[PDB]
């Protein structure tokens, strides 16, 4: 099973190049649905929320990893219902952390370091796929700083 | 299949009146506590008769402590000869989607984690009793999780 996130028309030349770079990257959709607009994906749909507001929102929403990117629509498959049927979906690091084999990987809001489409007037924040034994560390270090 | 789904067969006995047989068909999406992951069980195992301790039928707080020693399963189709369930600890279905049913007075929303709670509320203690078999079926209440942490806190702090 694969969802379709249709890009609204009015795409400039660097804006098609920026969406071309996010091939193997994690996207949160609200509800599993065939027709889906890009504005429900973007950071405008999250209102700006803080780190606690993202951690709440990343559990009510349903994560999806992008497949191939068509010039008209973004084809993504969700991690809950569409991955048990298919075999294996590629996933790209945005982390400074090297992934090892056999790790369980959770997701963290982008604390460390933003693909913005200027013609569409929206930003895009994407989560950081780092392993779960570090996820209970990196959060716990930074809370201990504050 | 073996990994994706697991169908149990809760058998229905011979002698059941139709006032009792037409009550089970209204129990389509429920939550059923199997003690094991056997594929053939009976209604005397599911019901509150098998729930009793040594002589003592426990109250709503001890009703919690013998839930988590068991296996929650959801009925998927009520046949005349058997009830087919799916234990949640193994796997849902091939498609991974099983329909539940609200017994709560509370609406659900998307992405809310469901914890199950005993029939604790007033106007809620609805036990489907089968008269020909002397069987009550105390069905638990699927609630959202931020309710289920309140009610357990209301019951533990009361004792």
């Amino acid at each position: 099973f694969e969802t379709d996130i249709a890009i609204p028309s009015g795409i400039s030349r660097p804006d098609a190049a920026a969406l071309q770079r996010c091939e193997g990257r994690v996207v949160f959709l609200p509800t599993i649905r065939r027709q889906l607009t890009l504005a429900d994906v973007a950071h405008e749909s999250f209102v700006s929320p803080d780190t606690l507001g993202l951690l709440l929102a990343y559990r009510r929403r349903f994560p999806a990893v992008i497949t191939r990117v068509l010039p008209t629509r973004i084809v993504a498959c969700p991690l809950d219902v569409g991955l048990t049927h298919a075999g294996t979906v590629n996933l790209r690091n945005t982390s400074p952390v090297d992934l090892c084999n056999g790790d369980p990987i959770s997701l963290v809001p982008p604390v460390f370091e933003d693909v913005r489409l200027d013609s569409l007037d929206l930003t895009l924040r994407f989560p950081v796929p780092l392993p779960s034994p570090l996820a209970r560390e990196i959060v716990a270090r930074l809370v201990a700083r504050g | 299949m073996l990994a994706d789904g697991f169908e149990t067969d809760i058998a229905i006995p011979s002698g059941i009146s139709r006032p009792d047989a037409a009550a089970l068909q209204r129990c389509e999406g429920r939550v059923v506590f199997l003690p094991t992951i056997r594929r053939q069980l009976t209604l005397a195992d599911v019901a509150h008769e098998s729930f009793v301790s040594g002589g003592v039928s426990p109250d709503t707080l001890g009703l919690l402590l013998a839930y988590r020693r068991r296996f929650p399963a959801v009925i998927t189709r009520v046949l005349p000869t058997r009830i087919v369930a799916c234990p949640l600890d193994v796997g849902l279905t091939h498609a991974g989607t099983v329909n539940l049913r609200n017994t709560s007075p509370v609406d659900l929303c998307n992405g809310d984690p469901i914890s199950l709670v005993p029939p604790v509320f007033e106007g809620q203690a609805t036990d489907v009793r089968l008269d020909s078999l002397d069987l009550t079926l105390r069905f638990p209440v699927p609630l959202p999780s931020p309710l289920a942490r309140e009610i357990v806190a209301r019951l533990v702090a009361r004792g």
Binding site: F1, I32, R33, R34, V81 | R77, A95, T97, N99
Partner: protein, 49 residues
């Protein structure tokens, strides 16, 4: 039968259903009286003794 509309995407709800309806007959009765005097039965019958 309960009729079906098909929907797209993932399949959230249904298995096809029946309904067996039973309704109880209410019984009534209708009366109409009718009389004949003895002056006329002697005409309808035939001969006398």
């Amino acid at each position: 039968h309960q009729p079906l509309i098909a929907r797209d995407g993932p399949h959230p709800i249904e298995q096809p259903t029946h309904n067996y309806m039973t309704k109880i007959i209410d019984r009534r009765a209708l009366n109409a009286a009718f009389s004949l005097a003895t002056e006329a039965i002697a005409l309808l019958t035939g001969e006398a003794l």
